[PDB]
Amino acid sequence: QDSTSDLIPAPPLSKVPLQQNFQDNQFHGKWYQVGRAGNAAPREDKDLLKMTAQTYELKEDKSYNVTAVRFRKKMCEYLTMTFVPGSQPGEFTLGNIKSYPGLTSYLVRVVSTNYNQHAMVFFKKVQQNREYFSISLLGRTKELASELKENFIRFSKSLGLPENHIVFPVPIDQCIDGSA
Numbered sequence: 001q002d003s004t005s006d007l008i009p010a011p012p013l014s015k016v017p018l019q020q021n022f023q024d025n026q027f028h029g030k031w032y033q034v035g036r037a038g039n040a041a042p043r044e045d046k047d048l049l050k051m052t053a054q055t056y057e058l059k060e061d062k063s064y065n066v067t068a069v070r071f072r073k074k075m076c077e078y079l080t081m082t083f084v085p086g087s088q089p090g091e092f093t094l095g096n097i098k099s100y101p102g103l104t105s106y107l108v109r110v111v112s113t114n115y116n117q118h119a120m121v122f123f124k125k126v127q128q129n130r131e132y133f134s135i136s137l138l139g140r141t142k143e144l145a146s147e148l149k150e151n152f153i154r155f156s157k158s159l160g161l162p163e164n165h166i167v168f169p170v171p172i173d174q175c176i177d178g179s180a
């Protein structure tokens, strides 16, 4: 007993650049997820199209405590995960993976960034032995130059993803900034 799935395969990592000479101190702080792409099934619930935000807090041990917030079903929802430096600067694994049920593999790779406007970051993970990947386009503001968005689309297609697996969330006020 169980289940079936059909997923676009994760690309070979030779298709996924790594930011040269990654600077963890320059990367820390608040980012908006201005574009999202991945092999997971796109979801209908229109409320999910709202932009979310993340905070990368660099710790003394060089790990980040990463907090995301989204405005969902009238609530601010918060999720904090720990990113441990991986094999190469700009890569990370997941701290305390035993406490994520059904999650057996997790990898983060920063593809490119100029640290004070934008970033693209690649994620790959195995959740109930299905392989997912995603890419995020991060902005220091909630809006990004069109060319950055066009670059993000082309890079996502190059990894085998079609347009319908690529989205630009709608900016919002609730939760991701907070209060006047």
Ligand SMILES: [Y+3]
Pocket: none
């Ligand atoms: Y996410």
